[PDB]
Design a protein around this ligand. Structure first.
Ligand code: MG
Ligand code: MG
Lengths: 874, 874
């Protein structure tokens, strides 16, 4: 067969590889039939037949029809039913389908082959009500999709019926009413077309075939191929398959199931069956489905076939399946099959079980768990979330995934108090500012009134993998009365509240939180992931606790420890930085600097203790100094600064003005500051090495790395590196001990990428700051472009927000260029990236292909990065 | 001669091309002697002799000394004087000199060959006072430079003399005192060295030679060659030349002159002569020089030789010369010669005259006028600035070159009032802000108290080529009493004041301003410049007047007309922009937009009228909208906004907050704004084409070009270009006429350079915004990096400020890449640059070599750009 290919259980003319000719659906049907699946018989008319059709002036090419007839006879012989025969009726389904997804194609046409006589022959076992209802629908469907008759013309007839009979829910019409409606519908053909409904089944088929071919040249189909650049294709195929029913007595039925539990992964058929009826019934309230056992009970012969079909599906497709099947008088029929959707929990278990069952190897199992699946297992989740549907009192934005349960509080201070007592608090505030960070961190969940997916609470919460429901308009926080009205409900300080950051749901009361996992499957799965990936995955952390959390998540070290964050850790430390900034003499400045030394030395010791055995990369002071000044009205900033440092009103104002900048992103900061005030870098370097030594003397293994930020020339880097090495030697001489360490730089200035070869002579490693690199490369001030990014995305100007998904064409090109030039100068140059791009799958895949050595992201994104670093190689 | 080369008038063993062996000075001596110049006889010991010396363990290589003796005998025979002979004495000068400039080399040693007897033989015609004084100095010089004897040891003897005699100005010592001092100095040799001063002339020479060779390996010489990467050189040469005197009677003398007037260029010897004496005398107050005629009078034979020497110098070196000469008993001797420094006025005249005299061709004349020379002729200048030395009452920073004379005023408003009456005003203010721009522009000169070379007044003033003296600390402006105290002096409103922006001088009264030129030489010179250059030079102008000024300066069009500047032109226009911004409904917004239309349409008509015949490139709204908001306390900004627009306090504050940004350089501006509010670009495009048509109907030739700013993708550009073309066609259809025009883009985002090929499919021209490109490439916020650039420059981290001198290695690489990729996509793509780099010589040279089509700079920088665009090809 060259233009028409039939198929059936264990028989098919085409095979799974003919996506071009048979089309995706046609090729898959051949595949399904070829492996022994109980698929109803049918045939496919090649895409080549469509092309010949279009060229011949949209006319049916010579010989084709002869083949189509050849194919149906085979189907008729296979089924033991003939087209247009009331005693042994054969109804057909006609579907389109090209090689790739394609809109504007003819919609599916069911029950083709009906007429007055066949309709009565169908009412025989399936009943009059259904037979004539199907006939009414078919006349409409076939009439509109094949004969191009407006739907309104038919509904125009049906409405009058119930408008006179007295109903609106068609499920109320009778067999005779439908018979009468069949008569009215046929008049529509005569009125609109000028000729009667084609009662000859073969005429229907022919018109259906031509309609599908014609569908290829539909407006939407053409637009898509020109508004989504495509070519070659050559046309669409037509899939004709025999119809089957489950309403032909108590020996028939329809059902749906997953070859495995989509929620837990348990290896057991999960679904439901409906005896003597079809899917429609349920939707109306006409019928209520049972569980699969009813099928094993009433139809053991068909059930056994269902099990063999399921094992064959998993055995051949190597994947859990979601299927739709029908049992027609003890005979099982496999209709639609597709990879089953599932929870992360289910995804990991199924992947591991299939490896243990010897169905697939690790390399393939890795592709069975999507980043989205793995992320569900990284945050807390509710046991039975369905049981709280009535307790839900509001829905806000799902700013940050995960379930949280705790007592409501209204200040960062109170969330901190709760945390200090080892208790769970839900911080509820109008919106958050950098002043609530401590409390936001202390709470188990955050709920705000204003702000969207990019508000302060959402962003910060996502960075910690902490549950957060944002922009929940239906809430009013009464700071003064210690209460919050949520959806008219009043919650007072101390009462329990639940939050689902994945849905944005605000649940009243304390819902159960799913107990921790004991399976061991995630551990097994992740071991295969770690075996396959070449990229190392590090974490960005600034405190001992985050370092520990990163390690428990599998981080191989810390790629970015931000020293400025360490000073923002407490009011006392911030005040200390301010004292240094306001110091009126060099003696008090050094005195203030010395205080910064213990803080730093102390924090690194704890960080080094937590990362015992792993490299820890510390970045020097990054922000401009004004970021350490209090915020608010100039009057209050001055008042506060004088009270905290001793400066008088005059010098306080002068200094604030001197530290003010027009574009703080690109001013007096980073190495520019460490170069102009070398004592700053000497202080931090001193703290790093003394902490490193002190821990090494306690048996801790320390691999310190110092990163110089915002370098644009090799001279800036060489200056800081020289300073760092001089301090290293002094400290090692004073302590009488020496340890290894590396000095490197953050590559975030476009110029640094351009002169990367020279910068590599001074740097032992490259740490890409793609966030800032993107800012400078796009000339985008992330804090301010939010005002037009949405417009750019909606108008097709941007495909993705460059700050979330690495811009491979632009920013990525500078990343590749810098990596190549740096490595030519220093062959063993370690190159990596630190930032959210280091935790975003498509970006991680790019970094892997670009040849980087590692990525570094937030502690809870680490497992996601690991997963993505493996999948790109598989 | 292989290691020693003699030379004299018309005789030389070496030639001008042996810079390697003879060294720069040695080769030039050979050249001078080779063309017939009356240079005293001498010889040069090759740099190869020095290398042999160093290798032989700093020992004199075999045969060398024999040659040195051979050379002096020749010199002795040439002069008819012998070394170490009191009756016919021969004194020598010993100088070092490698192939290239080299510090740490032996300092010049004069009068070598002296001793007791020769000293007396010298007192014969030159006198006792001089002979013994020279002997005292030589003992010290030779002793310190050749014998390494501390100077302190000698001054230690001289001081005691006057300390006992009773003087401090050596010019007071007598012949006998010096004779006695000669005795004391010789004791120093015995005390410090352990042996007496070498009285044998040949011993002196030998030691002198070795000292010079040794000088090559001096600390400073080595540092320079290692702290200024150099190699190959191979050593230094030694130049020995016969000494000559002009104090041997009234038949001798010394003089200096320029072969042409260094101030005006007049082709006449300009200098002075001193009869029977040497240069020293003048410095002490011992003698006062006459004019050159005294020489022609008293020594016609020598004068005639001087004229032939001068003609030979200009004829061979093709350049005006500054020389030092000595007449020893009727015999003329040419000592030092070098290209003469001169004013711009002189530079242009000399260059043109040498072409007319047939001495040089245009291509060479072009190199005779430096940018610095040409700039002097582009601004107003004082006639006789020396005559005002007593009227100078203060000196501030020379923020902007040019002379200005006008009446003192203290407000921008008053300078504007003065300008409106066609009168000259000098605006005197503490410092300036963007609010004084109108008055600053109206004044003929600006004087501020605070601020340096980068203050607001300095920057703006330089942009207009307007005279400005900045940071003049010695002034206090009494706004309330309409007066200013300058250096204790009181100047009241209306009194005359003069300013020299080139020196920073504040002159009391009204000094004469040099009358305009009538020569025609600058016109001639510039015609050769324009013939040679390939790059076109355009001007950046936003008003009809600046467009006219640009044209009078030779601009070939306007490469950048900034539309936002047009709105900042008056309070009324600014208020109109604010009304658009605060409009509460779309109807009032369009109403406000329409008002912006006449303003725009009106200004372009005037600009098009002024550039009749030349292309005019207009850039769409560039700044973020908040730049159009009033400045000050938030309370006043709101009050003012409500009063001017009708908004209430609530909506005013909300909108200000919404327009606020963290980094205004990279926010919601440029095409981002024109894309999100298309009506803005439709309004400006409409104004452009209607103005273009309206002028075309009046006989004006208009070549409008529209530039889209801040593009980072081809999609942003395509969106704006589509809008611009739709408006073009509507306007042409409404008016019933069509004209040509181009649409292009400003390339200033690094990413734009990376995807330049795609952007060229939409753009017909590329306009590089290197200022912003530099900002984003370096990650430098020009407004804020001033705080550490000075440190970077002093520590060698940066060679130049990237905003003043194009960073060829980094920014330039993106410029080359964008140009090449853009042109591959659109072969005839016009590529240029707009900004101060377009007026900076080294930057313009780079742009020319990079293949750009044009540069565009400020109106008064246009001639400088033209000049630089020619010199890089010559
Ligand atoms: Mg950064
Ligand atoms: Mg710009």
């Amino acid at each position: 067969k060259k233009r028409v290919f039939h198929f059936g259980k264990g028989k098919s003319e085409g095979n799974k590889t003919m996506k071009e000719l048979l089309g995706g659906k046609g090729a898959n049907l051949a595949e399904m039939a070829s492996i022994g699946l109980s698929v109803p018989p049918g045939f496919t008319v090649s895409t080549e037949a469509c092309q010949q059709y279009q060229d011949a002036g949209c006319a049916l090419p010579a010989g084709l029809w002869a083949e189509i007839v050849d194919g149906l006879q085979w189907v008729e012989e296979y089924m033991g039913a003939t087209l247009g025969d009331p005693q042994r009726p054969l109804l057909l389904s006609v579907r389109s389908g090209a090689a790739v997804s394609m809109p504007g194609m003819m919609d599916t046409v069911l029950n083709l082959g009906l007429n007055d006589e066949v309709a009565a022959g169908l009412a025989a076992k399936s009943g009059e009500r259904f037979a004539y209802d199907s006939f009414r629908r078919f006349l409409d469907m076939f009439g509109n999709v094949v004969m191009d008759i407006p739907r309104s013309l038919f509904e125009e007839k049906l409405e009058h019926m119930k408008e006179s009979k007295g109903l609106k829910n068609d499920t109320d019409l009778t067999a005779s009413d439908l018979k009468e409606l069949v008569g009215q519908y046929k008049e529509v053909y005569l009125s609109a077309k000028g000729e009667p409904f084609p009662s000859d089944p073969k005429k229907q088929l022919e018109l259906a075939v031509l309609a599908v071919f014609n569908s290829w040249e539909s407006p939407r189909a053409k637009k898509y191929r020109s508004i989504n650049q495509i070519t070659g294709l050559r046309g669409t195929a037509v899939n004709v398959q025999c119809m089957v029913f489950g309403n032909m007595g108590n020996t028939s039925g329809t059902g749906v199931l997953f070859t495995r539990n989509p929620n837990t992964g348990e290896k057991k058929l999960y679904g439901e069956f409906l005896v003597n009826a079809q899917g429609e019934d349920v939707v109306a309230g006409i019928r209520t489905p049972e569980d699969l056992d009813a099928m094993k009970n009433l139809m053991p012969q068909a059930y056994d076939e269902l099990v063999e079909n399921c094992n064959i599906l998993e055995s051949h497709y190597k994947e859990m399946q979601d299927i739709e099947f029908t049992v027609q008088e003890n005979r099982l029929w496999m209709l639609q099959c597709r990879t089953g959707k599932r929870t992360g929990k289910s995804a990991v278990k199924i992947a591991v079980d299939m490896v243990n069952e010897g169905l697939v190897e690790p390399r393939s199992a890795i592709k069975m768990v999507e980043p989205g699946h793995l992320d569900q297992l990284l945050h807390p989740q509710f046991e039975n979330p369905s049981a709280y549907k009535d307790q839900v009192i509001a829905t806000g934005l799902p700013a940050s995934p995960g379930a949280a349960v705790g007592q409501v509080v209204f200040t960062a201070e109170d969330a901190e108090a709760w945390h200090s007592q080892g208790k769970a608090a839900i911080l509820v505030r109008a919106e958050t500012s950098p002043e609530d960070v401590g409390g936001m961190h202390a709470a188990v969940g955050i709920l705000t009134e204003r702000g969207g997916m990019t508000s302060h609470a959402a962003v910060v919460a996502r960075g910690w993998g902490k549950c957060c429901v944002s922009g929940c308009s239906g809430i009013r926080v009464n700071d003064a009365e210690k209460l919050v009205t949520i959806g008219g409900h009043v919650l007072r300080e101390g009462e329990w509240l639940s939050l689902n950051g994945s849905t944005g749901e605000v649940i009243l009361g304390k819902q159960p939180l799913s107990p921790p996992a004991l399976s061991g499957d995630l551990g097994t799965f992740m071991a295969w992931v770690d075996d396959v990936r070449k990229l190392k995955v590090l974490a960005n952390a600034d405190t001992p606790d985050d370092a520990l959390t990163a390690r428990n998540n599998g981080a191989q070290g810390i790629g970015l420890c931000r020293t400025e964050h360490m000073f923002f850790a407490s009011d006392e430390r911030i005040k200390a930085v301010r004292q240094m900034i306001m110091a009126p003499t060099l003696e008090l400045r050094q005195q203030a600097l010395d205080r910064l030394l213990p803080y730093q030395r102390s924090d690194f010791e704890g960080i080094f203790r937590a990362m015992d055995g792993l490299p820890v990369t510390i970045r020097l002071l990054d922000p401009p100094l004004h970021e350490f000044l209090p915020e608010g009205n100039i009057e209050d900033i001055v008042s506060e600064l004088c009270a905290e440092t001793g400066a008088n009103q005059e010098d306080a104002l002068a200094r604030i003005e001197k530290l003010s900048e027009v574009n703080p992103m690109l001013g007096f900061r980073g190495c520019r500051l460490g170069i102009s005030y070398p004592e700053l870098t000497e202080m931090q370097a001193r703290a790093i090495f003394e902490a490193a030594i002190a821990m090494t003397n306690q048996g801790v293994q320390v691999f310190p790395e110092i990163m110089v930020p915002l370098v644009g020339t090799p001279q800036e880097l060489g200056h800081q590196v020289t300073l760092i090495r001089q301090v290293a030697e002094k400290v090692f001489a004073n302590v009488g001990k020496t340890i290894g360490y590396k000095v490197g730089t953050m590559i975030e200035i476009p110029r640094a990428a351009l002169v990367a070869d020279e910068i590599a002579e001074q740097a032992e490693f490259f740490s890409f700051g793609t966030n800032d690199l993107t800012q400078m490369t796009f000339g985008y001030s992330r804090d301010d472009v939010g005002k037009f990014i949405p417009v750019y995305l909606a108008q097709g100007i941007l495909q993705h927000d460059p700050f979330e998904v690495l811009d491979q064409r632009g920013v990525g090109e500078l990343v590749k260029f810098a990596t190549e030039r740096g490595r030519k100068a220093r062959p063993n140059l370690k190159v990596g990236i630190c930032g959210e791009h280091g935790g975003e799958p498509s970006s991680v895949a790019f970094f892997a292909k670009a040849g980087l050595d590692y990525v570094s992201c937030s502690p809870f994104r680490v497992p996601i990065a690991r997963l993505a670093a493996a999948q790109v190689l598989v």
